[PDB]
Amino acid sequence: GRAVWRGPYVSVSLLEQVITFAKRNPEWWNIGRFQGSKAPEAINTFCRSSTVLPDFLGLKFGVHNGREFVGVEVQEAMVGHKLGEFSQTTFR
């Protein structure tokens, strides 16, 4: 994968989406997210190649798969992977 000494990749567009979300919901971002409350809304994105951050913990992401935005709620075990690994593009 990407060389560890060069760091991760995260898209700039994804960061802007999260920053706007935090401003809209300051109370949940600071306190609610850690007591266990669910996110008040979801963030739709096309950034399937971005890495999942633990600051994205309790966040709900709608990841595009070609047709719709598949909901993905971040868990601790999903840390370190790409958003595109949890949104399937083919169906049988």
Partner: protein
């Protein structure tokens, strides 16, 4: 109304007029890459310089997207035949597709190139 005529060449070396497809768009990408070549090299050096603290290197990484378009990336440029625009079967040293190159060689329009046997 407005018109955009297809790119065609009439040359005495070929009995028929030669048309091409999709050369203008690739020329636009080549110009954009040259426009942003200097900045790209500077940021490549900084992002692969181990002497810098990464919290600075991460911020430099974000400049590849905010300060230049995606179409200035050198990896998205392809080589097309200068006469027909065909991508597959290109002969790089001449810049022409194998279909055009073979016929021109037969009539001696390519300097120094002739049939071989051994």
């Amino acid at each position: 109304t407005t018109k955009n005529f297809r790119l065609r060449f009439r040359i005495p070396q070929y009995p028929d007029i030669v048309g091409s497809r999709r050369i203008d768009k690739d020329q636009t990408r080549r110009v954009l890459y040259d426009q942003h070549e200097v900045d790209r090299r500077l940021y490549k050096a900084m992002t692969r310089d181990e002497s810098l603290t990464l919290p600075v290197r991460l911020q430099v990484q974000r400049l590849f997207e905010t300060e230049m378009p995606r179409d200035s990336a050198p990896s998205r440029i392809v080589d097309r035949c200068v006469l027909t625009g065909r991508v597959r079967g290109l002969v790089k040293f001449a810049g022409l597709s194998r279909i055009m190159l073979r016929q021109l060689i037969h009539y001696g329009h390519i300097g120094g190139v002739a049939k071989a046997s051994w």
